[PDB]
Design a protein around this ligand. Structure first.
Ligand SMILES: *CC(=O)CC[C@@H](C)[C@H]1CC[C@H]2[C@@H]3CC[C@@H]4C[C@H](OS(=O)(=O)O)CC[C@]4(C)[C@H]3CC[C@]12C
Ligand SMILES: *CC(=O)CC[C@@H](C)[C@H]1CC[C@H]2[C@@H]3CC[C@@H]4C[C@H](OS(=O)(=O)O)CC[C@]4(C)[C@H]3CC[C@]12C
Ligand SMILES: *CC(=O)CC[C@@H](C)[C@H]1CC[C@H]2[C@@H]3CC[C@@H]4C[C@H](OS(=O)(=O)O)CC[C@]4(C)[C@H]3CC[C@]12C
Ligand SMILES: *CC(=O)CC[C@@H](C)[C@H]1CC[C@H]2[C@@H]3CC[C@@H]4C[C@H](OS(=O)(=O)O)CC[C@]4(C)[C@H]3CC[C@]12C
Lengths: 319, 319, 324, 324
């Protein structure tokens, strides 16, 4: 998976969901008066509204990535082989992994607010019944990474506004330095001084840009694509550029084999305007972008407002 | 640029057009009785119909990539620094570079027919007024590459059904062997036998798959994405997979700097069913796929039938 | 710099030392009765004897890498940007960085012994030289059992990791070095089977295309990956002369030639010397950048009950043998 | 195998020979009056004298690489999969593959002379040994002018390319090797400026991160790229002993250690020897896999007017100098 925070003028928060099987995900809006019930935390009958992609498990939203009305955004990505949850403790505040996105987006407003309030937080091992890390951004253009591993909970400042999967986030930032010579154009020939190299192709400075489907390759490329994306754009141009950024690490069917004839592919791509509260999305089967505006519904309500995420190819026939 | 021939069940032929400035390209259909006039070749008042992307230069179609009704397809890609045209000679048949796509698709039917008839062909230096190589495929699932360089004209068999830019095609096939160890899944640990390597990420066998925007990187990745694409699919699923294949080498704005604050990006993506004569397309600004059916117009006509290629973002609003 | 532990039959400990500054290193044997005076640890008048490469300042052996008479070796490699020393604390067993090799070699016998006794050890910030800037170090420890460990003191304290590849370079932290190894699991010494484009006859134009992505850079991660590959595939079950020859070739595969590693204005880091120490026989083989010929010093050919350092020349001129 | 032309002050021609099969090579001086009998060319009873590495079969020098008394050198490297020999034709100047080094060295003096005289030369398929399978070769030719050329005979005939990097390995064709060099134009020996993610403080955790993508594989393209990097950045304006030391280190950067290049069932291609020939003084420096010490043979210390081959031992045992 690949999540980014993009700030050309407005602020946009979304992710690619690359997996092999769907979970019945849908576009759900959680109004301010939907009563949240947490395992080891007090209930929240009044909170901020939020919109995002979630799997509805009998009137309860299990979010994958969402934003609230206050301009905060959280996205959950797999951390298999690295993350470790811990049994609940009376000392710290215990949030289960599946309610993290819901609790954070319903309570807080900014990344600074989230960073300060996580010092007494323990990600509990409470399952829904029978390993993830998160990316949190806001309207300031900054983001943090929340990872709970063998050494406990960690909150890192994210200088690149992106996140994928394994390994630990400090290791991902270290691997970024391995590509410091990459440039979008042509490099200066300090490789063989005094020798005229045949610059046979444009953009030879990206010849070693990673293009694999593994977590490190997708992290390096999406950091590159996001950093050089256009800026100072209006809404339609910004959301258009956002999708192209995540398309640069698209996982096509057949390229990522996770099991015997089992492939992981980009199931859906979400783009959420942090200011206007609009969720844009397409999927693997539908290239056309759809939009859902959370601020066009009664937020003071108390029932989930669900929309369809996976659609079929909406081809426009000109004949 | 990146052109492919994709044969899941039906046969599909298209390309990415990655450039920095548009040329007023449009979806044009050339009926069977549009009179072609060639520089050093006899005119063709009766020929096969064809549909493709072209820039209309006063009633004359200058094609970038097109297919005919007989299931043949040609696509033109830049060959800068490598190609060389030659002055016209009375010995050989002289085709100018800009009429190559039109002459081939109006005269012949199959790749075998094109390969045999190119033995007495010279690509002339006749400009429209004041360097390209081609990819030719058909319904057999095979393709050839036509390149005219310093050593004359060359017709190569294409075992990978793909093409980009520089260098020469035999050199592109040689560079493919540099990635023979790449697998879509996890490799067997014959790297350090007797050592348990921490397979921290899925698809570590693609860690060295190229992801740059240069011609060699895009050639290696699109060959990989095309070879492992799904097969035995219906029309909608096949065209959907075709676009994802070319998206795997999408050029996002800011990643490919060809000049001072000048960037080359994927302007449009075309997908043409070789059997049904349908052209599918989207562009950088519009993610929704459009379709034009050549067999829904009077082919026995004599006037070009032009449609709009570049559109704006066709967002579907659910609220 | 690159340090390895090689066990074809006997066990060999050694390293390349790649730097741009020399410190007057020499082959230094420390006998069993040279009184070691430690900063915040009791002075040991008698101990194990050791042989290695060291700088001698005020008749004190400051070892870069060495082995003791009992077949245990320790090598010191720079850990700049990651390592961190700590102030002296009363509870912990305080060992200064410059005395780590000397203390470990003189006290303990095996890797398990060393690993069991670093439980309450703190690496102190006490420095020997007050005007020579030096980056923090981390250590590789091996013995005749063929196993090795990595001793690292970073921001979060001291850590001891088991080393499954028996090699070490510089940054980053060792768990990150092992993680980076998985990025090269597809590398093979020969030719891989074409599961890249099944159905296409890829033209294997050259031999050993399975190593086309083997790193060859002068940086820390590149030399770590390649030396792990070269060490794992080196011949085994060899005699003394053949094993020593194979050892120097393993480290030659990651040698740093003058001009390839620029560390300043026309200042280049290069492989200054290469040490190779037989753990079983206590023999130190070595050469340098200027002398390709291999020299040897047997620790057991000297009086180990002595009380003073026995030094020999390390850097030599090129020893060309003129055939006519 | 890797061949280079190194010009720090004097000019040095040499190569690594990486293979799994030995052919009894030795240092062979061919005096000026050893009668050369050529397959389809006139026999030259007197010519230039040469020194190099060769196998002697029936008192015939089959050179792998050599230089002549006038400062011109030629090295033979395998071109398997690309090279093609041709039948003898009456018009063209037919030179067999095994006599190319001997003929060129004995006839001509400079690279320009050689380049001017291959205009009508055809590389014939006449083979010396009828039972020893050998792949087609291509050649690197240099002289005291610091320039070099590449002689390749492929499917489309004979070609002579000017070599701007003064190095050569194996496949593919030389214009493809030069094209592949451009894929590494971003490599620097030090640290690059961060135009990768402008506005982000990338943590340069290690030195020489500009070489993180320098190839280090055993294959033909990897060793060609790295040896071009190592040759271009080697020190210059050096004396005899320093230049020879730098020369062996350049080729050591692409050395093939046993176990890294698998060419069959537990059969490995490794660097068997390394030759280094001073073009100005006619001195051949060399070592081998088993002997790290450098030996030398001066061609001018022997009678060049002689009529018989003067041979010396190439492969030697490890010459360890015992300090005590
Ligand atoms: C690209 C990737 O990294 C793949 C991530 C994918 C498998 C995850 C991402 C979000 C997950 C859902 C989050 C909400 C709940 C959490 C529950 O955790 S449990 O309580 O410990 O069982 C599991 C179900 C569900 C719906 C997650 C399913 C997996 C995800 C879609
Ligand atoms: C991604 C790439 O490789 C970029 C290719 C792009 C610049 C080309 C592809 C097709 C070209 C057009 C083909 C038709 C004519 C040909 C004329 O050639 S000339 O006669 O020699 O001048 C030039 C105009 C035009 C319309 C080409 C323009 C460039 C292309 C779109
Ligand atoms: C490439 C590497 O990782 C090696 C770096 C190289 C420059 C180091 C390795 C061993 C060092 C010496 C160790 C012994 C003493 C330690 C003293 O530390 S102090 O406490 O700060 O004084 C400094 C001097 C010396 C000789 C070290 C010098 C640097 C090293 C050779
Ligand atoms: C790594 C490389 O490219 C080098 C390959 C290596 C095995 C070759 C290089 C030089 C060869 C010898 C050259 C002299 C003769 C030539 C004879 O050719 S024949 O006409 O077919 O008989 C074969 C024998 C010999 C000694 C060559 C052997 C192979 C090489 C050492």
């Amino acid at each position: 998976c690949t999540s980014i925070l993009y700030s050309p003028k407005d602020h946009y928060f979304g992710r690619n969901l690359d997996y092999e099987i769907a979970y019945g995900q849908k576009v759900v809006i959680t109004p301010r008066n939907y009563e949240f019930k947490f395992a080891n935390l007090p209930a929240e009958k009044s909170h901020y509204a939020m919109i995002g992609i979630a799997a509805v498990a009998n009137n309860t939203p299990l979010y994958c990535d969402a934003i609230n009305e206050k301009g905060l955004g959280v996205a959950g990505l797999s951390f298999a082989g690295q993350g470790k949850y811990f049994p609940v403790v009376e000392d710290k505040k215990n949030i289960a992994s599946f309610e993290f996105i819901s609790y954070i987006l319903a309570t807080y407003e900014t990344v600074d607010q989230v960073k300060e309030n996580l010092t007494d937080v323990n990600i509990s091992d409470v399952s829904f019944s029978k390993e993830l890390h998160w990316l949190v951004g806001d309207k300031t253009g900054k983001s943090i990474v929340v990872e709970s591993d063998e050494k406990g909970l960690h909150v890192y400042d994210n200088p690149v506004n992106a996140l994928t999967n394994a390994p630990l986030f400090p290791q991902q930032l270290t691997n970024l330095a391995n590509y410091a010579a990459v440039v979008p154009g042509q490099p200066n020939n300090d490789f063989l001084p005094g020798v005229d190299l045949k610059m046979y192709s444009r953009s030879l400075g990206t010849h070693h840009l990673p293009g694999g489907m593994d977590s490190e390759s997708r992290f390096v490329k999406v950091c590159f694509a996001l950093n050089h994306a256009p800026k100072d754009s209006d809404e339609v141009e910004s959301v258009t550029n956002f999708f192209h950024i995540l398309q640069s690490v698209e996982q096509v069917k057949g390229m990522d084999e996770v099991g015997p004839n089992i492939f992981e592919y980009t199931m859906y791509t979400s783009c959420m305007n942090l200011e206007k509260g609009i969720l844009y999305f397409n999927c693997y089967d539908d290239s056309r972008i759809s939009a859902v505006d959370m601020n066009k519904e009664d937020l003071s309500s108390s029932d989930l407002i669900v929309f369809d995420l996976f659609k079929k190819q909406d081809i426009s026939f000109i004949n």
